[PDB]
Write a protein that binds this ligand. Structure first.
Ligand SMILES: CN(Cc1ccccc1)c1nc(Cl)nc2c1ncn2CCCCCOP(=O)(O)CP(=O)(O)O
Ligand SMILES: CN(Cc1ccccc1)c1nc(Cl)nc2c1ncn2CCCCCOP(=O)(O)CP(=O)(O)O
Ligand SMILES: [Cl-]
Ligand SMILES: [Zn+2]
Ligand SMILES: [Zn+2]
Ligand SMILES: [Zn+2]
Lengths: 520, 520
């Protein structure tokens, strides 16, 4: 009995087909992804394979003006259209609180939305009861397949789930649910959740009874063979984990932004043991046509969004690289633009200026902006780069705290983690061959108590004013040292307004990669 | 017989009283220098001393909006008013060619303008004949004093003297002219010229018959005792050189910008032998009042400058370092500002293969003639930074030509030479421990045929477009390889206009030293 699993994760409001960098589609002849194109491939596989399951491993929320306007009603509508078989809750599904999850998604989804390690308490327990389930038994042909859900344990730190939701250990909470499925003589069990590739591998190893793990959160790209686009594989597809009880357990993930459709075929035996498994994510490129019914429906929702593009804020003559593969691994000119804007909004009278430095987590830059659209930069383009609606605050940090933040910036370098810092008024050099915690070899900063601004070595006993996102001021992305050691905090202007005012002032921008970040 | 010599040098259009940094006078109670104040002190000394000579050692041309506008007619007018007894030609008296020297100055000066080592040839020899002289015999009391002139031998590389003027050795060309004076039984001879303190010391040593040397060009400050202002003496005043024939020969110089008045008393005997000499430059500070006749005449020439040169273009919150000690030895933020303006003026859409058609800039540090203090930016403040009225041209250069230009930039590093290049869109690293001609160790340039601008190693076989002053495009400052090897030359907008339009767009500027020029 062969099962075909189709899976998506971290789609992030990429409902319309996108460019190859996951930004707004301009040259439609080379655009990719989108629900319309996804519908075609999904309906293609359903007519070829008898047993098909379409799953989503979380983080459909947040990413473009689609979620800004419809706040999740677009997710429920178009996930229903594609006839998804199950969904796991991600951390971003809570960005608008529990109420932002219950009303638009949990109450309007025609498919089960799962999470086994989320426990509701107090007044919410009655309201959110049964709107999400720890597992679901799905009939597939004349067989049944069990799907247990899990959501990041650290979700209270990543989103806004509230005080009345308890997020338990994934493994601790999954084992009882898998055992209850086995008492129901469900011998085929998929672990579908949103905790990251590293937690997916522990669930495959530690949780007895899970045959497959379908994950997300880490934007992991797995491929066996020659990859078809720019994403570099982090491992074979499927990534095989050997469990504690000796069974080979495939672990899968399909990058992000709906660019690929995960595709895995499992051959089970009569008792639900995995005989073999093979597959590879399917690049949803121009060769696959967009479904016209889904596309027409998309275009009827699109005109409510078109008022976020009428005004031109300015022009860019260069590609504004806001891609994770860039801003999370090295200096990206999108980060330099934002940090240049943050410092420019903070031009006050004290020496030469009160602030000279800026830091910005690469994980806070959520999209690039294309320059082939006549160079036009609209509020919409910016809305996808800075979709959270946070502020760019002013902070005071001892040099010691700043060095610790930059050590953290690359303490686990290589995993596309979002704590890699883009900077302004700072020249940092890393030596990755050195130990974690000892990788910053040079850290020069732009002086304030000086008549001519120049770069001087950071001194740990000194105190520096830095402009950073409020998300970092609150210890987000693991920067707890900023929250615990900062000596002063003042709240600033909205992020997208700071970047928008600057673009309007400069009229034409051309930020470059200048060497603010170097590697030894 | 005691002679009192009053001497000025490298005034550079400092006709009006200035701040203590020789910039625009703002707080008039604390201003210094100026022609009016000089007239008072010179008159005071002539009313006290019997034998007085007022001499200038060159470089009255070029420095402020006074010369940019009046092109030397202000020099002739007020040098006559002050009753200068002689002037030596400097290298900057040729910045506007011979025509720019003959028309306003040589043609309107009521005093002798001297230079013994400038020889005219071919068609010019008759045209400029007698308009400048190798020597002059002047009555001083009931005695007669001879004055031989000399001009920097390297003036063809520093200015625009043309092809029909030969600059001979000061010593080689001076010895016959001094021999000419003693056969006329003139036993008192002053060597008044513009070649630098180091050459002045050779003329005192090598040319027999010279009793005193009055120099310029090196802005050398000499003082005996505690100096009265910020300038640090480079030696006693007078600096005594022992000639090859055993005579003690005083050498004098008086800084620059009309801040000081040189003052030297020489006691001769009946045979023209120097018995002794003493003195010290007189600081022309608020304590000396401005002469009312020269001052009123100054205010009547000011009306052509104040009605067009007093507009505010913008603000700077940082000190704009255009000082020679910085811009000729290391990256200086005034140079970065100018190059950033040059690049911003050349931001035209040419082809869809470029972020912009040109990305790079080079600028001879010796072309940056003043700083701007941040303690309002007007067209006049800028006029002192860029007083030549040149253009910022676009040139095509093979990488080899660019590498040779950057090798030349530091081939004689350490003598405050003006060929040291300020850059934009270029990251150059020098290793001065290496041989001259092999000191550039890294030379990265900003890409043009690229969607995201980034720095890549310079290719000697490729061709790059560079924006540079017209002075460099024509082989000035020894940049022969640029003129000889450039593959294309187009004239651009005026220097001060480009730097001015840029400041107006930015409203507030704050250039920094970013690492464009580094030393290994
Ligand atoms: C909604 N808001 C406002 C606010 C105000 C005050 C305090 C906290 C928040 C937010 N503002 C900002 Cl500025 N960053 C936020 C954020 N809410 C979340 N973040 C971080 C996401 C970065 C990526 C993490 O991980 P990642 O990108 O590696 C994986 P995932 O696929 O996203 O799970
Ligand atoms: C008006 N024009 C156009 C042009 C074109 C072709 C030929 C001559 C002029 C000029 N444009 C520019 Cl861009 N630089 C100029 C310049 N004319 C002269 N320069 C260089 C000055 C170097 C100074 C060395 O001397 P220095 O700075 O070491 C100290 P001193 O003041 O001599 O004591
Ligand atoms: Cl007089
Ligand atoms: Zn997530
Ligand atoms: Zn001079
Ligand atoms: Zn000179």
């Amino acid at each position: 009995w062969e099962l075909t699993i189709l899976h998506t994760n971290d789609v992030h409001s990429r409902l319309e087909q996108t460019s190859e960098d996951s930004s707004k589609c301009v040259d439609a002849s080379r655009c990719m992804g989108g629900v319309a194109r996804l519908f075609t491939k999904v309906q293609q596989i359903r007519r070829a394979e008898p047993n098909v399951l379409l799953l989503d491993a979380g983080d459909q929320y947040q990413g473009t003006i689609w979620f800004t306007v419809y706040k999740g009603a677009e997710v429920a509508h178009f996930m229903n259209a594609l006839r998804y078989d199950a969904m796991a809750l991600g951390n971003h599904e809570f960005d608008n609180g529990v109420e932002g999850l219950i009303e638009p998604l949990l109450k309007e989804a025609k498919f089960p939305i799962l999470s086994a390690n989320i426990k509701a308490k107090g007044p919410l327990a009655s309201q959110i009861s049964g709107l999400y389930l720890p597992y679901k038994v799905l009939p597939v042909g004349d067989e049944v397949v069990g799907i247990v859900g899990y959501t990041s344990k650290e979700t209270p730190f990543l989103s806004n789930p509230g005080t009345n939701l308890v997020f338990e250990d994934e493994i601790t909470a999954l084992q009882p649910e898998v055992d209850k499925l086995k008492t129901l003589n469900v011998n085929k069990i998929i672990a579908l959740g949103h905790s990251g590739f590293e937690m997916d591998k522990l669930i495959a190893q530690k949780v007895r009874g899970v045959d497959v793990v379908v994950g997300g959160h880490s934007n992991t790209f797995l491929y066996t063979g020659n990859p078809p686009s720019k994403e570099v594989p982090a491992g074979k597809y499927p990534f095989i984990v050997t469990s504690d009880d000796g069974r080979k357990v495939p672990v899968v993930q399909a990058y992000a932004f709906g660019k690929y459709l995960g595709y895995l075929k499992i051959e089970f035996d009569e008792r639900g043991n995995v005989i073999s498994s093979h597959g590879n994510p399917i690049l949803l490129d121009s060769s696959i046509p967009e479904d016209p019914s889904i596309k027409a429906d998309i275009n009827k929702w699109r005109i409510k969004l078109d008022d976020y593009s009428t005004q031109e804020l300015g022009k860019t003559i260069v590609y504004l690289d806001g891609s994770s593969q860039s801003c999370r691994f090295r200096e990206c000119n999108m980060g330099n633009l934002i940090c240049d804007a943050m410092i420019n909004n903070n031009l006050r009278h004290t020496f030469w200026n009160h602030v000279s430095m800026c830091i910005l987590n690469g994980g806070g830059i959520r999209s690039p902006i294309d320059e082939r659209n006549d160079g036009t930069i609209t509020w919409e383009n910016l809305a996808a780069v800075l979709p959270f609606g946070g502020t760019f605050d002013l902070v005071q940090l001892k040099g010691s705290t700043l060095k610790k933040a930059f050590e953290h910036s690359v303490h686990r370098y290589g995993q596309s983690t979002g704590e890699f810092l883009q900077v302004g008024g700072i020249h940092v050099v890393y030596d990755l061959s050195r130990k974690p915690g000892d990788r910053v070899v040079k850290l020069d900063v732009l002086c304030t108590k000086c008549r001519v601004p120049s770069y001087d070595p950071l001194k740990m006993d000194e105190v520096y004013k830095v402009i950073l996102p409020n998300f970092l001021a609150n210890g987000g992305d693991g920067f707890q040292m900023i929250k615990d050691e900062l000596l002063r905090h003042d709240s600033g202007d909205q992020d997208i307004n700071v970047v928008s005012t600057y673009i309007s002032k400069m009229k034409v921008i051309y930020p470059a990669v200048e060497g603010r970040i170097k590697f030894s």
